[PDB]
Design a protein around this ligand. Structure first.
Ligand SMILES: [Zn+2]
Lengths: 103, 49, 59
DNA sequence: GCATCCGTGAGTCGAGGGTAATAAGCAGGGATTCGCCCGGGTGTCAACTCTTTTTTT
């Protein structure tokens, strides 16, 4: 390897335009990976009834099927004050909620 | 964040903030000037000579 | 990971890297194990050979 | 108009001297840091030439 005036110029140019630092020493030839890092550091400058589109407010959102499939829609019924519907609110959330602790 | 801010000034109004290592309560800026390091008898009026 | 990675940065009161604290924990664990299953107290000389580290680093 | 609940106070000089506990792991890439060495500016010395105050003639 060499450290002539052209070596520092090409190194700075290749560090500025953008390229992997590991391949920088291989493209220059001779210089190792540790040398280029030290140079740059030393020198600096380092089905339902609604699809996924027609989903309005106060509607069911329980998915049916596979999203990566052909037919994937939601229920889309009267499901205000809740994301899911009443028919699925009891199957989604923990049924028979019985939990308590100290406070 | 608001609790930390208004406890860094007084540390007595809200709940006491005690370090996990030491068993004594921390001395904030307000408590530092009341009776111990304030101008009562520690630095301003009474001082070593 | 989030609870352990953050507890070693702010609670220490001083800048201590993760590798340093993990090495400290490993050294403490091996020292306790050797003191409990070998003899009275593990010496720092044998701790280097047990962990395969230089004496200047373990010291 | 009264009854109930939350802040301040407590003298002053002296002695006495240090403290203490929990504890994952490894793979990627960079920023940091310690050894050697060329080196150019700072010192420390052999060694070649004008001046002159007398001390000698
Ligand atoms: Zn539904």
């Amino acid at each position: 390897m060499s450290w002539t005036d052209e070596r520092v110029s090409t190194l700075k140019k290749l560090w500025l335009d953008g390229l992997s630092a590991s391949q920088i020493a291989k493209q220059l030839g001779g210089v190792t990976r540790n040398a280029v890092i030290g140079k740059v550091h030393r020198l600096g400058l380092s089905p339902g009834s609604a699809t996924v589109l027609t989903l309005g407010a106060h509607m069911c959102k329980w998915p049916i099927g596979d999203p990566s499939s052909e037919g994937f829609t939601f229920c889309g019924r009267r499901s205000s004050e809740g994301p899911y519907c009443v028919e699925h609110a009891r199957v989604a959330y923990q049924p028979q909620q019985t939990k308590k602790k100290s406070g | 964040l608001q609790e930390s801010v208004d406890a860094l000034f007084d540390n007595g109004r809200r709940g006491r903030v005690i370090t996990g290592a030491n068993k004594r309560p921390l001395k904030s800026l307000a408590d530092m000037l009341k009776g111990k390091q304030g101008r009562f008898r520690q630095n301003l009026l009474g001082k070593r000579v | 990971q989030a609870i352990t990675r953050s507890i070693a940065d702010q609670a220490r009161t001083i800048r201590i890297p993760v590798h340093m604290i993990e090495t400290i924990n490993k050294i403490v664990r091996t020292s306790r194990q050797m003191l409990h299953e070998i003899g009275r107290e593990p010496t720092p000389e044998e701790l280097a050979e047990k962990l395969a580290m230089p004496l200047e680093k373990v010291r």
